[PDB]
Symmetry: D2
Subunit: 312 residues, 4 copies
């Protein structure tokens, strides 16, 4: 497998670079940054090589700038983490506009070079996935974002720590926006494979507070250590593992909707099977009326931003 990472000079991109280089199937990794940051990438490469010597793994790493995009051609996957730091004097809309310009430029250049799969991490992840889709002119299954996957994993942590179980014993799914209008699917939450509603202690779960913790966790980590790096990198690792061996894992990822669930012209976190050819939306799942109404509200929340940045 061949993976390029645009934004490897940041903390998230660097953690992703390290984790993916360590995967046995990742034979070639391409780190891409602005010209001024090339040296950072050169440091990262060396660091990662040292790390591989310790983990008994191997990889060949190339470095290029974000204009020529050399070595990008032929990539099975391009992960984009490039994004501006949102200053306190900015709105969600300001961040959306600026990062939309960045993501659209990169998507157009990538589409000019080759056909590949785009994995968007830049926030607002749903809106940036939408921008990447429209500007790349790729097939919609080839463009997806981390979206609510991270949220699901954080929710998992909460559940696992409240019930005092191994974190991997918990599975959960969150659909909709990677934001305050996210819709956790309690019906799709389980421990040891058993639905969480089948537990008598389920009544003791402070679900409302837990969901608020999930919605706030990104801001919390920003305030405490300056932002997440390992969490999102490992979520990306999980998705990439599904892609590399064509596992078709049922996850929640942001992708473009062309009629599914009665919605169109919007990117949102939905149930998807992730495999070598990208993302297939799973419509075979049945939602409760409450969950579907919250999902509708979330999609309509995303669409305002998408409309605002579509043609930038």
């Amino acid at each position: 497998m061949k993976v390029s990472i645009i934004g490897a000079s940041g903390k998230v991109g660097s953690a992703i670079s390290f984790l993916l280089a360590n995967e046995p199937y990742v034979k070639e990794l391409v780190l891409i940054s602005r010209e001024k940051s090339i040296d950072k990438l050169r440091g990262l490469r060396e660091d990662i090589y040292d790390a591989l010597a310790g983990t008994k793994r191997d990889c060949e790493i190339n470095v290029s700038d974000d204009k020529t995009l050399k070595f990008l051609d032929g990539s099975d996957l391009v992960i984009i983490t490039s994004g501006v730091p949102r200053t306190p004097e900015m709105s969600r809309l300001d961040l959306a506009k600026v990062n939309a310009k960045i993501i659209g430029n990169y998507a157009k250049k990538i589409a000019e070079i080759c056909e590949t799969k785009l994995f968007i991490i830049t926030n607002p992840v749903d809106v940036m996935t939408y921008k990447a889709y429209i500007d790349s002119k790729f097939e919609r299954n080839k463009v997806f974002g981390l979206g609510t996957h991270l949220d699901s994993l954080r929710f998992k942590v909460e559940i696992a720590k409240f019930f005092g179980v191994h974190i991997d014993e918990v599975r959960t799914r969150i659909i909709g926006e990677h934001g305050d209008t996210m819709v956790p699917l309690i019906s799709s939450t389980s421990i040891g494979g058993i639905p969480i509603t089948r537990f008598k202690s389920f009544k003791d779960l402070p679900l409302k507070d837990i969901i608020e913790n999930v919605k706030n966790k990104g801001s919390k980590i920003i305030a405490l250590k300056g932002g997440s790096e390992f969490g999102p990198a490992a979520a990306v690792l999980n998705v990439v593992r599904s892609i590399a061996n064509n596992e078709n894992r049922l996850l929640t990822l942001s992708t473009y909707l062309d009629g599914e669930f009665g919605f169109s012209d919007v990117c949102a976190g939905v149930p998807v099977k992730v495999g070598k050819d990208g993302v297939e939306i799973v419509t075979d799942i049945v939602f409760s009326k409450e969950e579907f109404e919250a999902f509708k509200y979330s999609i309509e929340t995303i669409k305002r931003y998408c409309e605002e940045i579509k043609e930038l």
Copy 2:
């Protein structure tokens, strides 16, 4: 296994925390920092939990300050990365004196709490291992530093990339000081288990350039990306994997010499077996005339610092 990490607020300590929390046998992790950095640790913990949800692993993580050292009792291992940033005007001896005070204080406090193993990463690593040994009053096999292990892994990288082979195909051992007096053991360098001196292409290896590259790599990464992160953490992971399952791996780690090789009252990188009870020096290995001379010189170099910081 229970591991405490004093200095997890730094980049090396953070990466070590992430990697070790991911190990299935590390069930308890204690992150320790100065009081003002507690919030950083609180971010790290959350981040790591998120990452574990992505890697299908699990851990219980606690946070404490570097004065109370709460939760440290019971640790099978204590890794110390705490250290002062070396300013441009500081010599190695100035750094040694400052960090020797820090390391000795931590060692005294830990020895007051319990008996455990100490894994010193703070530089100059040989001298800090010495200080930890003498201040802790622990058994010598219980006190060791990364030493020349990281140098050996970096040498592995250089060789593998020169000959174009998988990094894990190369094995090499470097003994002596983690510094300019390090002694590469070409007699114990191999590719595919084959001594490197049995390859006709060995004559083509620019050995002097490669060794200089290894000696200067820390500074190079400092200048390129701000300092090493993943390399050191993965080297620590390799050592800890040998410890957890009592593999008695033959590595080069810094530890106190009490007669081996005709030296005493010094810490230096030597071939050791790494197991659940610590490091055991391997004196059964035979060095070339030249390699033993170089190792003697390096030992003297290290002792000149150890004598200056012993009683601080």
Copy 3:
């Protein structure tokens, strides 16, 4: 960890020996057989060692007869696969009686040597677990059998292959007897973490035929290949993995009931958490009315055999 395997001369026992010797935490493995088969075990040991050389793993393997039980003392776990072939003229009760003698003899000898955990594979597995419990006099959480775990995994396979999903995507739980009275828990079946009943395609699943397949799979593999070996060995590996790192995985294993679900004096497959100290029955799960009724019937069926062998 230290594991003894009584019955390693058979195919299931040999596969279990190979898989467990490869686990990094399994540092000592004791192979035990009747005297006449000691040579077989010797061969097995050599074979396994060669295999470890290929897998880059390690283990120390000892051999001993089933009378001295040398090297067994100190074992964290003892797995028993010794059993007689069921001939066409044998009733299920005839098999239970003949194998109860074997299991009870071994259990009494083991309890005379030391206290340990007993993992019973010999069929009829529920009845043999009961016999092991009464003859060892061990605490009930220390004695368990594979029970409906294998059936569970087989059910998983069926579902996955019908829906064309990765096998690890499916989770299911089967309780009751390891036999025709087993009770599949559709309320605890899921694909990608989503309850299977929330898929619109669930109506297409031929559940009755699949359950008959699971019930008959043992005999089918007997008729095709001469008996299962890899399936049960891997199921045992899954259980041991939960034990070794105290994961408390929620599985279905057979263990003695002392009041749970309104039953006592019987061993049956039930939800359990699997840890370093054995199995803890989980009563916090709520089955459907029909499922609990069928579970009651199955426990009665099992108890009828347990009463016949309690005094044998």
Copy 4:
């Protein structure tokens, strides 16, 4: 990766099928046998599926007879373990003739269907590799046998157990015939990367006895348990892991010589790099006078048999 196994109904082929199906990169496995043994393969398939459910792995397994060779087309690799048991009345030449007919027939049928790599396990492994190469008309880098690799691994075990070290700490290389004329490369024997001749304890190594044990291990395992299973399967696994991720591991495998080391028209165990495109002989290695004389003798020994079976 797609792998076919001709001979999966035997014990070595069944163990290989289990191990390879468990590998994440092996998405499709084809089991091939004589028509009469097809049911056995069906059994094997079900068994392996059950095992995958326990290991959290996945695979698509197909079954076919050895005449139509259905599903074989498109295989990246075809492993041949088909061979008749050596009865006490047959000499090595008799066995070679019979198995040469089997191997040549299979090689021609495979080449008739598609181009692929052939991995020969059938004994005499060097002679059967020679026969497969000549009858398939494939490029020589695409045809290789396990050869002395297994021997090397067995030697590893011996060395490790003598020095009381973890098995993975030892590396060794044996070249020449998979038989009594094998040539151990003591220079290429190491512990922790340290050449074995640089240990003072090397004087105590009963080297000749260990070599005789290695030469006789196959017969010993046959006499004790009826033949090797897991050892050869794991050796195959190691090679296949090199192939699948193009690691180009430096191993000793049997392959056709066309001038390397001064020999031609023979298959023998030689140092090779094993990758996605097959084996590349490493002529860069230099042997001592004694090593080369032993290797030349072994080559002549093999050539006799090869000439006897070339036209069968």
